Amino acid sequence: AKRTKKVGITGKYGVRYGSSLRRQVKKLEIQQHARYDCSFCGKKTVKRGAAGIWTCSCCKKTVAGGAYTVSTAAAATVRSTIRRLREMVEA
């Protein structure tokens, strides 16, 4: 049964801090507590340790990432830029 209408994980804060601030925390809290796919073993076993550290439960491998997500949008763009420039110096 659905327990809360819209607060979700932010129900632990009660009525404090303001609805707008609680809404911002809710979006980032879900991402940092989420489970992610591992690119090395293909399983859904990647969770966060400290901020920017992501470790897979299987295959015991740790990847440096974003504060609250495994990969940021800015880092994805950088990979494309490096790949494009890499192919212009070797071919």
Partner 1 sequence: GRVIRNQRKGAGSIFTSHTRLRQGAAKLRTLDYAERHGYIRGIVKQIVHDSGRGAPLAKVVFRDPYKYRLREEIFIANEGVHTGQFIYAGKKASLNVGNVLPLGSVPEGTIVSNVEEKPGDRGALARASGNYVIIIGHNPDENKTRVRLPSGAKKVISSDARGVIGVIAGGGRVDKPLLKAGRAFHKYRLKRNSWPKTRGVAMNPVDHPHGGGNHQHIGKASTISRGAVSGQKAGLIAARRTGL
Partner RNA sequence: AUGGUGAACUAUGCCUGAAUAGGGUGAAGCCAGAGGAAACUCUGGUGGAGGCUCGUAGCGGUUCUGACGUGCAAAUCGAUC
Partner RNA sequence: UUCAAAUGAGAACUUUGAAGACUGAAGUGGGGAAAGGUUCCACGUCAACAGCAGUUGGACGUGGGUUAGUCGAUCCUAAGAGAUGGGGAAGCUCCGUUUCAAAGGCCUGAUUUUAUGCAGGCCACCAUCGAAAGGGAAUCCGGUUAAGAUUCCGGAACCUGGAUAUGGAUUCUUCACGGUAACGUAACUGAAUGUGGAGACGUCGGCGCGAGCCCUGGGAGGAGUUAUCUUUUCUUCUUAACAGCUUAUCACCCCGGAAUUGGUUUAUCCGGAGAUGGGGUCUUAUGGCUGGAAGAGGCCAGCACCUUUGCUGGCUCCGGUGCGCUUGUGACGGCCCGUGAAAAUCCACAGGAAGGAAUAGUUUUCAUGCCAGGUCGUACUGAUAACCGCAGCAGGUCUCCAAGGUGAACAGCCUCUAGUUGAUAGAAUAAUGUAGAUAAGGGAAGUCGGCAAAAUAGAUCCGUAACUUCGGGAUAAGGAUUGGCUCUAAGGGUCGGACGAUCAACUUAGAACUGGUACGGACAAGGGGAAUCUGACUGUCUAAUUAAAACAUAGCAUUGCGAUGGUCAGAAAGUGAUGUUGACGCAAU
Binding residues for partner 1 (CB under 8 A): 13, 17, 21-22, 24-25, 28, 40, 49-53, 61-69, 71-72, 74-75, 78-79, 81-82, 85-86, 88-89
C-beta closer to partner 1: residue 11 or 24: 24
Are the CB atoms for 57 and 48 separated by under 8 Å? Answer: no
| Distance (Å, whole) CA 86 – CA 1 | 53
Q: Return phi, psi of residue 63, to 5°.
A: -125, 135
Minimum distance from residue 1 beta carbon to partner 1 (Å):
28
Candidates 53, 59, 67, 75; binder of Zn ion (CB under 5 A) is: 59
| Distance (Å, whole) CA 5 – CA 11 | 10
Of residues 65-84, which lie at the interface with RNA (CB under 7 A)?
Answer: 67, 74
